[PDB]
Write an enzyme that holds these catalytic residues in place. Structure first.
Site, PDB file in Angstrom:
ATOM      1  N   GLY A 130       0.526  -0.973  -0.124  1.00  0.00           N
ATOM      2  CA  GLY A 130      -0.112   0.286   0.215  1.00  0.00           C
ATOM      3  C   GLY A 130       0.864   1.359   0.130  1.00  0.00           C
ATOM      4  O   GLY A 130       2.211   1.405   0.454  1.00  0.00           O
ATOM      5  N   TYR A 131       0.363   2.781  -0.773  1.00  0.00           N
ATOM      6  CA  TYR A 131       0.996   3.534  -0.860  1.00  0.00           C
ATOM      7  C   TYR A 131       0.865   4.567   0.786  1.00  0.00           C
ATOM      8  O   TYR A 131      -0.812   5.137   0.604  1.00  0.00           O
ATOM      9  CB  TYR A 131       1.276   4.052  -1.934  1.00  0.00           C
ATOM     10  N   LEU A 132       1.532   4.854   0.944  1.00  0.00           N
ATOM     11  CA  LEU A 132       1.268   6.224   2.348  1.00  0.00           C
ATOM     12  C   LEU A 132       1.280   7.803   1.095  1.00  0.00           C
ATOM     13  O   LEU A 132       0.393   8.694   2.041  1.00  0.00           O
ATOM     14  CB  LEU A 132       2.588   6.412   3.220  1.00  0.00           C
TER      15      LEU A 132
END
Ligand code: NA
Ligand code: NA
Ligand code: NA
Ligand code: NA
Ligand code: NA
Ligand code: NA
Lengths: 148, 144
Positions: free
Chosen positions: A25-27
């Site tokens: 997942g991308y912050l």
């Protein structure tokens, strides 16, 4: 650089498969100055920092508690899937992803080739679906950024 | 929430001071969708994400592996905690690297007319409470 083609999957294959659950997942969002990504690879957890206007990639291993505390900040930019590793009859290795959450029912199969004309000579087996190697929509970041 | 005035420091004070070395830096630039900050507070290390706020404690090795990606957006300083003769607590920061020779002193007050009545002692310099330039992120983002 590896040589590979990617396809939809028409039929889940039989045979010997090794399963690994994956959550990543991308912050950050693509216009940020940096890319910060969280991944769980089975039983180990990482945070990766990349900067293109940085030197230049950093990776730290983190524990499960650090990971699960930060995971919620990836909402809407995540890919969760189970990845199956196998081998075609001719011996080409493949990785077959079965996507979870809103990306279901997508399934993708990626094949690696030793010569970049074994790649062009490849005849997909019947269980493969349509090729998506060139389709920008099926790249990992595209998949993470797509929306329910 | 707390009431405080901040000043330059004309003379480093004498008296009982407790020292804490601090290092803190931004992985992100203010236009990013999130703010990600790294801080070492003496003996413990944190990464903070703000968009919601998340804080994770990290170890020294995680911290020092990521620290280089804060270059140009950092504040390093020694903070000294003390108390004025009338009892008001103060925090006095002595900045390191390119922010040297800056020193700042911040005072906190219990009532806002204790704040308004405050007479700075002679060792305080000019007040910067309202100068945007002396705010923490402004200091972090300024350059050599
Ligand atoms: Na998404
Ligand atoms: Na779906
Ligand atoms: Na087919
Ligand atoms: Na700076
Ligand atoms: Na200087
Ligand atoms: Na003075």
């Amino acid at each position: 650089t590896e040589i590979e083609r990617k396809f939809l999957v028409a039929t889940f294959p039989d045979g010997e498969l090794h399963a690994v659950p994956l959550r990543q997942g991308y912050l950050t969002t693509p216009t940020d100055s940096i890319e910060l990504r969280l991944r769980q690879q089975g039983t180990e957890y990482f945070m990766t920092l990349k900067s293109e206007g940085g030197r230049q990639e950093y990776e730290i291993q983190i524990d499960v508690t650090q990971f699960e505390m930060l995971w919620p900040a990836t909402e809407g930019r995540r890919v969760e899937k189970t990845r199956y590793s196998g081998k075609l009859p001719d011996g080409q290795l493949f990785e077959l992803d079965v996507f979870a959450g809103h990306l279901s029912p997508l399934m993708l199969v990626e094949v690696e080739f030793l010569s970049e004309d074994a790649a062009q000579a490849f005849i997909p087996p019947p269980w493969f679906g349509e090729e998506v190697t060139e389709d920008k929509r099926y790249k990992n970041k595209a998949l993470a950024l797509s929306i329910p």
